[PDB]
Structure formats: C-alpha cells, structure tokens
Amino acid sequence: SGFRKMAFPSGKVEGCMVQVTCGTTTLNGLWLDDVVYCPRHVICTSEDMLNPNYEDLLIRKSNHNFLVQAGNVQLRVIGHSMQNCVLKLKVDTANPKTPKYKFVRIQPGQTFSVLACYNGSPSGVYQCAMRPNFTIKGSFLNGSCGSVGFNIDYDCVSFCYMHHMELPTGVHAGTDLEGNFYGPFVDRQTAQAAGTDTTITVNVLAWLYAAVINGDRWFLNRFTTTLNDFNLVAMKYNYEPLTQDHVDILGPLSAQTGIAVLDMCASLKELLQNGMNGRTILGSALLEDEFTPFDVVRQCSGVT
Amino acid sequence: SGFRKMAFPSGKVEGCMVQVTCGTTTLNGLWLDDVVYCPRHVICTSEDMLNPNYEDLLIRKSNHNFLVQAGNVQLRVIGHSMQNCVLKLKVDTANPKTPKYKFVRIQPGQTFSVLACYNGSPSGVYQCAMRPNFTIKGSFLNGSCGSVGFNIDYDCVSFCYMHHMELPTGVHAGTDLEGNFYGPFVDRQTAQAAGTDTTITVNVLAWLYAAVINGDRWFLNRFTTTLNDFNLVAMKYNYEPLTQDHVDILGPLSAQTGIAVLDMCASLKELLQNGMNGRTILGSALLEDEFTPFDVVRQCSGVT
Ligand SMILES: O=C1N[C@]2(C[C@@H](c3ccccc3)C2)C(=O)N1c1cncc2ccccc12
C-alpha cells in the first residue's frame, strides 16, 4: 500500500549523459549510438540571446569547436547538423551503454521521468507531466539545459523531452528529440505567453481511484452525474473536458474498485464545489493531476 | 527555479539488485562484492509468520536451498549467516557493478531514495523520510521486500534502509543493512504500534526557505518569536521541538535569504495557528517536512 510520485529507474539514461561545450557555453547532451543530441542554443554567446540567427551562428562553427566529454573521456566530432532546435553531433565512437530506445512526441497530460544533469553528470530524478499548455513544472538551474525526459517499457527507453528554457514566469519549456518545441515557445530570451493551464481531469480521476484502492474513501458520496453535467462543472473550474476515450481508459480502475466512472465524476464535482474542508487524500490537501491511469495501474500492480 | 521531491539517480543501485528464492518465497537482495543481503523472513512459510523461530528455521536450510539470480545469471552460494534480521549469503562471484558504498544507520527526520524492486528487477524510484516514529510512508506491494534506501555523495552510495514489513496500518518498517530494525518493530505478522508521528520542524522550515528562494513569500509576516515561545506552539501541533542544532544547520538558508531563523519560526507559528487559508506554498496546501536543509541547498545549488 501507499502512493508516491514515483520516477522510472534512471540507470539506462545516466550512461547516455555527456557534457557539450561550444566556446564558453556548457550544457548536457544525450549520447546514443554515434550521435550526441543537445539544445542548439549551446552555440549562442551573451550577445546573441534576444534574437539569435542560428543558421548564421552555426556557419561560423566547425566540428572541432564542439567539445563532447563523457566523464573523463573526450569524444571526436566528425559531423554536425541542426534539426529544428537541437544539434546532432556525429562522433567517431558508438556509446557502449546505448540502451534500446525510441524518440516519442508525448501528448499534453502524459507523464515522464526527468534526469536533471549539470556538466553531463546526473544530479536527481523526478516524475512530472506535460501540462495542457505544453509547459512542465520542473526543478532546473543554470546548466540543466539538455536534461532529458523519458519513459521505460521493459528494456526500451522512450525519450520524449529535452530541456531548453526557463520562462520569465519560472516554468520550463523544451523539445522532443527531433528538436520541435512542445507548445508555442522559441529558443530566444523574450517574454513568451504559456497561456491558461487547466487541470488534467482524467489524471485527477485516476488518483481518486488510487485513493479508494489505498483506503481513502471519505469523498465517495451518494450521487452520480452525466458526462454533460460533469463537463459543465469541469469548464467552470478550468478542468480539461472529459471524453468517452477518458471514461474508456479508466475502465480497469472502475473494474478493480467496482465504482462506475460517472459515480467517481460525481464525487469530483462535490470536491470542486465544496473543497476538501481541511481533509486530505493520499496525504495531499489539493487534487493531484500528475498520475495517468497507466501510472496508477503500474504502481498498484508492480510493473518492473 | 521550481522545487520537486527529487530522488538520487538509481543507476549505481540497479546494478546490485538480485532475486533471492528460498522454497516458494521470492524477494529482492542486494549484491555487493561476494555477499548478497536480504530479509531473513525469506526462510518463512505460510505456517511460520505469527512467531517464526528464525534460528530453528535457518538450521533446516543449506547453501543450495538459497537460489540467487542476477537477471538470467544464477549465483553459487558458498556460505550463509544471519545478522539480526538480514541473511548474508556469500556467493563465489564478486559483483562487477559494485559501486563504492558504506552502510549507515540514519536518524529520524533524514531523507533517502528508495528503489522499489520485484523479483530483483527495479520498478521505480522515489524520495522519502525516516518518520520520527521510525516508519516510512512508501509505495510497496507484495514482493517489494529487500528493496533498499540510499543516499549518494559524489560516487559513494550510503545504503541506509532495507524494506521488511508493511504494518496493519499501511505504513512501512525495515532495517539498516546490519539487520537492526528502525523503531520497535519485529519481523513477525502481529499488530505492532508505530506510535505518535510528529512533523519534522527543521524540514518544514527548510521548505519555507526553499519557497522564499523560488518566489512564494506571502506567509512572511511582521512578527518574530523566541525558541521557547515557538516550541510551546510546536508541542501543541505535534511538531518536533526545535534546538540550537536545528537553528545552526538552517544558517546557510538564513544567509542566502536574509531571513533570520526565528523570523521564519514566527511565520510558521502563524501558519500553524491560522492554516493556509486556501493558499498554496510550492504547489502544496499543507506544510511539507520531507526536505532536509541539505536537500533544499543541494536542489537550490545543483550538486551532481
Ligand atoms: O541556463 C539557461 N540558459 C537559458 C537562457 C536560454 C537561451 C535562449 C536563447 C539563446 C541562449 C539562451 C537558455 C535558460 O533558460 N537557462 C535555464 C534553464 N533552466 C533553468 C534555469 C534556471 C535559472 C536560470 C537559467 C535556467
């Protein structure tokens, strides 16, 4: 029993973290096979950050200007290209520690583990969610750039996120591993609107199921509701609208607890309208939306 | 910026996790050099759990009754002994992946990372605290037994915790790596009183410092207080008494924020007396006590 914000074990990703230096700028890179991936803003100086011309900046750079270090070992760079907002440095040596891996573009409301790194050395691991407005609420300092987000399915690592930017508002923006930003963000030091973040309704409901499984049941009420009636309340409280897809993926948790999805929706409605009244659910005084139904089932079934 | 419940990277510990089978019972073991450590209750059957005689049970066991598997590879057991509540199985092969490590008995209120394992394979990593009543509020299912807690200082792993028991109340009890229980617990399937848990006051104050550093300042008030006056309020609200040692270790955070410890104590007092009023601090509606002053400084300075 018990329920924790649990990260994937980070071993397979630690063996891929390197340091990339271009002039004075150092940040983290990801070494898979004979390619190192990193944020392209590694080629920027103090002078460039308001509006860098990345093509023009890259053109003044050669293979030997990119210093790639894995622990003590220096790597030899034999090719470089820019794909959207990432640099791909071809090195002469395949990473011996390369795990089975894919690159995935995740959807808003999905979760992943972040290995926070500095100078190509791992500092910490935590779990987080792509917010509906495509930001992440991470823990990143100067030099964390190029730190990666991932999921693990058995032996296969799915890299989904590369950290690029802290926004003036203190939240975090980055790319998939093909260098496309999540959300409207660009790699320029400007004020950029993230926009209105909503709560991930399907995730709150998954967490209510997690609570019931672990013995917190006080919020279960006598009521039910409809998908329409519920969504009218969701909208008022800046909750993502709930669809039949959401109801469908909550099926396993519905089956395990014997609580219909719409009965759980009716409990949520009363929590939104009446608050928690100073009570707690799974040691929290607010509604948690950073567990997917998958995460709850995994943690409640012990997938390894 | 941002502030997360961050775990240590788990790579160095993943390479040490093995499966130990004795008869029908399987749980996790820790393979360091040519010794495997695991909970001694691996030698118990359905018949034994109310009051096992571990000496008598062990005496009916030989080296070849202990099946130790690291992934596919079977290990050969060439010696066995019982040290308090752990079994030490000597195997013929030194773990090639053994990191630099120590065994440490941590103190209540200290934090560590848990690698939750099943059948000797790692499932997840999270951060948690030794509660003042020597329990931990983990996330453990059947077969998680022998999962370990640790800290990392540079390249050195300090193993502090081995998981043995879920208590009838849903909280978790285990040993140091010399097999001594934290708290009054025994490895018998009986109702065992954990007793009154308090809040770790020094940790709440560290987290208030973390909040101020990250821009949440609303709880800063015009007041100050005394260590005596504060402790009178602490006692009322089941908070650990604050000592000059606590005040001393908060010095670096005091220096970074320019807020005196006793001014922060006066803010805490008003939060305890008046509650949060529906407001939040670092995305939480309750006072968090699972960050040490060390953890806050580490996360706010980027130790790698
Ligand atoms: O270290 C940098 N540098 C940039 C500034 C930004 C940038 C954009 C265009 C051209 C050059 C640089 C990339 C940044 O946003 N961070 C941080 C990342 N995460 C967390 C941070 C926390 C504090 C300060 C900077 C951070």
Ligand SMILES: O=C1N[C@]2(C[C@@H](c3ccccc3)C2)C(=O)N1c1cncc2ccccc12
């Ligand atoms: O799998 C076991 N087995 C014991 C029962 C307990 C025991 C004590 C004496 C002799 C034999 C066995 C050790 C346990 O407490 N757990 C669990 C651990 N963590 C989390 C658990 C969650 C659900 C069920 C059991 C759990």
